[PDB]
Amino acid sequence: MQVILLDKVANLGSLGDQVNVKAGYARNFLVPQGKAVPATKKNIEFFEARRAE
Amino acid sequence: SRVCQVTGKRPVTGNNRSHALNATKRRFLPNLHSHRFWVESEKRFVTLRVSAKGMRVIDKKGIDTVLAELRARGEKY
Amino acid sequence: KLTKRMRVIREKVDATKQYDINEAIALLKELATAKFVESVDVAVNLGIDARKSDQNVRGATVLPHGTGRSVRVAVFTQGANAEAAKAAGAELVGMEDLADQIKKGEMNFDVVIASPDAMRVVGQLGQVLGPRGLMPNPKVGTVTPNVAEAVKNAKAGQVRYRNDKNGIIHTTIGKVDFDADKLKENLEALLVALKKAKPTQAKGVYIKKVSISTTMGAGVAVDQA
Amino acid sequence: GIREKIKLVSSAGTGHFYTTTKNKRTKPEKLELKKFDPVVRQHVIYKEAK
RNA sequence: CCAUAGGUUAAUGAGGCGAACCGGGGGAACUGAAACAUCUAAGUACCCCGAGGAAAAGAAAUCAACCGAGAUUCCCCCAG
RNA sequence: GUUUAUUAAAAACACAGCACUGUGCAAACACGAAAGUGGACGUAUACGGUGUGACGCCUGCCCGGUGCCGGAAGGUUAAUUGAUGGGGUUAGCGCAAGCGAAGCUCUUGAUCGAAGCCCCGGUAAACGGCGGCCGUAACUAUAACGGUCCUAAGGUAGCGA
RNA sequence: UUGAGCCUUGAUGUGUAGGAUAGGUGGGAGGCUUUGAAGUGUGGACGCCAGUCUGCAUGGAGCCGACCUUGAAAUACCACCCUUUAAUGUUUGAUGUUCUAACGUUGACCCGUAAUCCGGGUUGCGGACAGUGUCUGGUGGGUAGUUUGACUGGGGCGGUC
RNA sequence: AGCUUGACUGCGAGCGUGACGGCGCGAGCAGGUGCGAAAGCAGGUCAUAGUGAUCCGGUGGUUCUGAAUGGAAGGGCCAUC
RNA sequence: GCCCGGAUAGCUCAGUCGGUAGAGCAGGGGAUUGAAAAUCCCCGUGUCCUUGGUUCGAUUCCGAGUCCGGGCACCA
Numbered sequence: 002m003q004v005i006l007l008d009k010v011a012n013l014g015s016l017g018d019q020v021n022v023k024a025g026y027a028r029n030f031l032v033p034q035g036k037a038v039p040a041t042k043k044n045i046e047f048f049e050a051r052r053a054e
Numbered sequence: 055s056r057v058c059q060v061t062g063k064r065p066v067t068g069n070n071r072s073h074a075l076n077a078t079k080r081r082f083l084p085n086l087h088s089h090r091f092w093v094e095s096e097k098r099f100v101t102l103r104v105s106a107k108g109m110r111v112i113d114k115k116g117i118d119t120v121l122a123e124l125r126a127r128g129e130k131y
Numbered sequence: 132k133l134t135k136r137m138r139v140i141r142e143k144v145d146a147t148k149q150y151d152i153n154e155a156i157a158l159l160k161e162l163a164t165a166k167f168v169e170s171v172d173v174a175v176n177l178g179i180d181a182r183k184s185d186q187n188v189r190g191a192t193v194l195p196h197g198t199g200r201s202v203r204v205a206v207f208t209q210g211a212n213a214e215a216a217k218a219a220g221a222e223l224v225g226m227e228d229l230a231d232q233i234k235k236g237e238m239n240f241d242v243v244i245a246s247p248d249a250m251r252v253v254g255q256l257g258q259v260l261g262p263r264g265l266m267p268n269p270k271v272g273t274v275t276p277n278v279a280e281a282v283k284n285a286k287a288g289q290v291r292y293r294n295d296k297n298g299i300i301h302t303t304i305g306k307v308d309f310d311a312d313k314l315k316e317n318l319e320a321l322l323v324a325l326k327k328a329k330p331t332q333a334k335g336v337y338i339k340k341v342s343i344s345t346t347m348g349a350g351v352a353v354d355q356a
Numbered sequence: 357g358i359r360e361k362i363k364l365v366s367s368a369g370t371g372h373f374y375t376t377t378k379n380k381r382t383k384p385e386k387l388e389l390k391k392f393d394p395v396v397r398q399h400v401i402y403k404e405a406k
Numbered sequence: 407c408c409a410u411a412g413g414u415u416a417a418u419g420a421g422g423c424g425a426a427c428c429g430g431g432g433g434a435a436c437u438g439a440a441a442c443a444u445c446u447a448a449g450u451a452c453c454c455c456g457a458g459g460a461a462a463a464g465a466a467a468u469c470a471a472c473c474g475a476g477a478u479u480c481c482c483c484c485a486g
Numbered sequence: 487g488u489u490u491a492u493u494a495a496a497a498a499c500a501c502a503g504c505a506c507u508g509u510g511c512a513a514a515c516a517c518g519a520a521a522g523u524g525g526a527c528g529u530a531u532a533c534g535g536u537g538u539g540a541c542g543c544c545u546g547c548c549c550g551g552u553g554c555c556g557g558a559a560g561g562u563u564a565a566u567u568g569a570u571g572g573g574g575u576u577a578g579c580g581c582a583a584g585c586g587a588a589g590c591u592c593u594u595g596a597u598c599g600a601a602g603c604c605c606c607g608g609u610a611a612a613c614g615g616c617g618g619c620c621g622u623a624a625c626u627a628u629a630a631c632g633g634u635c636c637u638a639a640g641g642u643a644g645c646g647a
Numbered sequence: 648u649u650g651a652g653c654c655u656u657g658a659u660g661u662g663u664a665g666g667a668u669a670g671g672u673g674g675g676a677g678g679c680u681u682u683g684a685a686g687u688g689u690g691g692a693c694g695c696c697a698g699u700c701u702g703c704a705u706g707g708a709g710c711c712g713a714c715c716u717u718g719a720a721a722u723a724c725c726a727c728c729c730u731u732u733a734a735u736g737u738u739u740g741a742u743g744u745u746c747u748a749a750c751g752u753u754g755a756c757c758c759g760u761a762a763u764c765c766g767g768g769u770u771g772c773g774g775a776c777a778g779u780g781u782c783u784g785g786u787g788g789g790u791a792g793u794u795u796g797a798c799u800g801g802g803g804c805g806g807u808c
Numbered sequence: 809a810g811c812u813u814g815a816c817u818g819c820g821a822g823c824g825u826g827a828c829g830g831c832g833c834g835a836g837c838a839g840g841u842g843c844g845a846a847a848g849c850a851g852g853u854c855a856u857a858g859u860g861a862u863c864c865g866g867u868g869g870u871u872c873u874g875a876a877u878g879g880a881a882g883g884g885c886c887a888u889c
Numbered sequence: 890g891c892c893c894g895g896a897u898a899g900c901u902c903a904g905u906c907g908g909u910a911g912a913g914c915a916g917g918g919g920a921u922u923g924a925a926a927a928u929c930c931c932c933g934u935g936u937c938c939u940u941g942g943u944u945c946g947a948u949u950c951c952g953a954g955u956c957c958g959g960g961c962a963c964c965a
Contacts, residue, residue, distance in 0.1 A: 002113070025775090028113055030748045033092050039113065056520075056780095065519090067432070074964095075444055076792095079433075081519080085780035089749075097409075099767090106780080132657070135682060137725080146655060165678080165724090172674060174727035182951045184942050258945090262719050264673090295672040296943055299727055303674070335570075344726050346674060363888070371868045375888060376815085380954095384940085392816040392840065394886090395869080399816080399841060 002027055005048055008036040017048060056086055059129060060108040060120055091117045100131050136164055137349070144351050152322075155343050155353040156314040162348035163307035169346035170200070171314060173321060174301040175355070176339040179330055181298045186330040188300060189293040191272035195316045197288025199306040204282050205233070205240040207267075209249050212278060216244075219279040220286050227252050234259060244273045244281050264291075292324065300325070307345050318343065322355045362387070364402035370395040378405055 003019045004027050013020045019040060022031065031037030038044050057064035063084045070078035084105045091100050095118055104112070112120045124131055133141070140162045150158060163169040179186045203222040207230060208215070216224045223240065225233055227249050234256065243260060245253050245267040253260075253267060260266035267273040271291045275281055294300040304317045322341070329337045342350040360380050364387065365373040372395045378387060387405035392398075 024110075024113065025749085028109075028749095034748070039116075041114070041116075064431095077444095083519080083780060087750085087779080133725095134679080136679095167677090169725095170674060172726070174673085176727070180951075182943060185952095258718070293672090295728095297671065297727095297729060299672075299729095301673050301727065340727085342727065344674090347678080347725055350726060361889085365868090371870095372887070373868075374816095389813065389815095390841085391813080394817055397817085397840070399813095 003040040004031065004037045005040055005044060006031075006037050010036050017052070019045070056083060058084055058086060058105045058108040059102045059124065059131070060104045060111060063105050063108065093117055093121070102131060137347070140164060141349050144349055146352075149352040149354050152315050152318055152353055152355075153311075155351050156311040156318065158351055159314065159343055159345060159348075160307055160311065162351070163345040165345075165347035167346075168199075169307045169348065170198075171304045171307060171309070171317070171343065171345060172301055173304055173318060173341065173343045174299060174350070175325065175341045177294055177298055177300060177325070177333075178335040178337050178339045179294070179298060179333045181294055181296045183332075185332055187294065188325060188328045188330070189270050189291075190324070190328050191284075191289055191291045192321060192324040193284050194288040194290060194304060195320050196305060196309065196313050198290060198303055199288075199309060202242055202285055203240045204285055205243045206278055206282060207243070207245040207249055207253050208278055209246060212246050212276075215279045216282065219282045221282050231256075240265070242273070242285055243267050244278055244285070246276060246278055247274060250274060290321075292321070292328075318353075360406050362406045363404065364389065364391070365404040366393055366395070367401035367403055368393065368396055370400075373404070374402060380406060 002024050003021060005019055006013065006015060006017060009016055010031075013022065022037070027037050027039070032039065038048075055064070065081045065083050068080045068082055070076070070080050072078070085107075086103050086105045087109075088101055088103045089109060091102060091112065092098070093100055100117070100121065121131060123129075143161055144158065159171060177188060179188065181187075204220075205223045205225070206216040206219075206221045207225055207227060209227045213224060213226060221244075223237070225237075230252055238259075243253075243265045247269070250267070257266045269275065271293070272281060272284075272289075273291075288305075290302050290304065292300055292302040302321060304321055305314060309317075326337065338355050341353050341355045343353055344350040358379075358381070359377050361375070361377045363373050363375045370393060372393055374391060385405075386403055388401060388403045390399050391402050393400045
């Protein structure tokens, strides 16, 4: 899946970007802890506002 | 019972169609796996015995969206 | 291994690129920095089994613009065929009874042609023409009654092609001095030839890889099609 | 057994062909005979032999 | 810590039985093929769950064929 | 001691003992679609299977076949992956024969690919095998012995109608 | 870190006559060297220690081709490649280790709860293994469904069809 | 021994033998060939055994069919495995 | 049916990235010992299964085919 990052993280750090990460790394450590979030299209625009604004 | 608590999938009966076409009743046991899901709206590890495909359905809709469908049909977690 | 004069032109060609017959003819002209008019050559890895008689690519083709070089022809005929060979344009025309004299010191030519009724005399002692690709053979189009014609095509710019016992074939198609468009017509003239000489049992892509090159130059990948 | 089974094909553009057998042992050469052809309605050459 | 799990009380409803019909989950064998495994027997016997007075199905991503018909179900032909 | 209750109570079965082998614990194994339980609320001086059957003297030869326990260069090889080639459809180009892009589709089936089997090394208190034809020891006879039959080896002790 | 394909880049070939550790087909009587060569002096290196290549450097201004031989002639130069082999890279895989956030926990502790079950939580030890589901090959009388012909001086054997 | 392919293709009145399936003989007719000067002969070999039903597929030919139309797939027919 | 390997002297077998094809067993003989044993050596009766291709040259390398050995595939 794509999903956006909230924290820094390792090889994909950017504090906010869409990277094709395996559903295993996301739904297990990333999201289930606070470092990523599923790009349900409703969040990609949500955090997008944080960028500009 | 080995039945997905989400997709509702359960052991379906079939037949072991061999080379000589010898019918033999069997079953397709779903790939269920007791996984511990975390809910941000409740702060708890809601463990649910769902199949492989049942988990992906939770990724799109959401653990909160899935549970909402459970409490609706009497499902207790 | 190579020298600057060779490492300089190597940078003018992309090893990992399959140029077109129209782009290869122009680039080839820039791959000849030698101090003499180099000749154009085109090799290709035929997808055939060189170790199978029923899969041999051999014959002759006439270039639409010749090879751009003089080809001293030497024909060996008998009877009236002697005159027809001389008036044809053959540089040297020796009789069948004087075939030994040529082996002595009169051996200066690029190609040899003979008549069917004179292959039993030239056939023997051919240990000097065979290993030099000068041994007349009805296959290469150097053995036929109409020697008058055969010689004319050779003097016009006809080139022979024969795949080695490995699966590769190379033949001249002119010089580098020739214009771009000119070379293209000549190159395609050969490409269409091999396709016509393709064996029936040939399986897989007959044309696996084609590449052109000069005398003192590197090769260039080109799409035959 | 041994004496294989062949089929003479019409040398013409037709697809007609006659069936028969031969001795591949001492007769490996390609058989060829002129027979009638119901398609072209003319005796055409018949080759092809195993 | 919050919050839940849990505990208590109250209201409502459910539980059982029952000849057939009905939907769904399970699902043979004997037998026939003059044997026999594909096949047939049969999605029948039987087991189990649920509901009604009917149940089930049901308002086209269906057929037809250039002319139309227009949800489902039932009966007679089509056709052994 | 046990056993065919009701025609066989025996040389059968069981038996302490001995041997091989499996098992490191959530054991092997067994009952079960699963859970669980038994094995055992035990821990290799334990437990399960098999074989033999107090004790005394001892328990040989043979690893080809069939199994088991290992190793291993090369060879073959499933699912899956889908390289090439061929065919159907058709925008266009052809005055017509014909060919025919993209897309779609059908078909054909390289490459990727562990076990297994074969091969090789062991195991016979594993299932079993432990025989034929000749020559010979200077009275006969027999055969200590020596070849062969290529099936692995061809009867030690003891005993023997 | 590495086994194999693939693509450039560099090595690489001891039948015999012989100036000599000749790959096969082709182009080819000249390119090469003052963008500083032969010829000597070392290191690295292949290896049948026969011989050859090369960076650096000394030096400094040459080295060659039918040659008369060889079935086949050039380290004179350049291409498409093979045999063999080495190093980057690319591609498809393989191996092992570390880590923890799933998963396992018939370790300890706490609570529900004066409870050997179970559930939640904490912690420790393992760990993307194990296990399980689907597909697949092998194995499989533990188990299940059956076949295992008929003539025939009865049947069986033999023979026959 | 010379010349060659009638061991050919579409039919065949009539007749023989079998429960049937099936098999066998057949002058002659039409088209196209070989041999001989010609009259004629040849639809394998002196004749009689040298054999394999069906179903299911493969190959070539034939627009016969082409589940909306135009094709194609498939099927059918002939030859054949 | 597909694929790999094998077929070598009378027998059992080794062998090559393309070229005088060897060993063992057996037999005759020789050497050696004073002699009989042993031991060692010499002596060979081949289209390298069959038909082609490349080559100056094929038991080799390649293609087809046959027998045999191993595995897999094998629904009229």
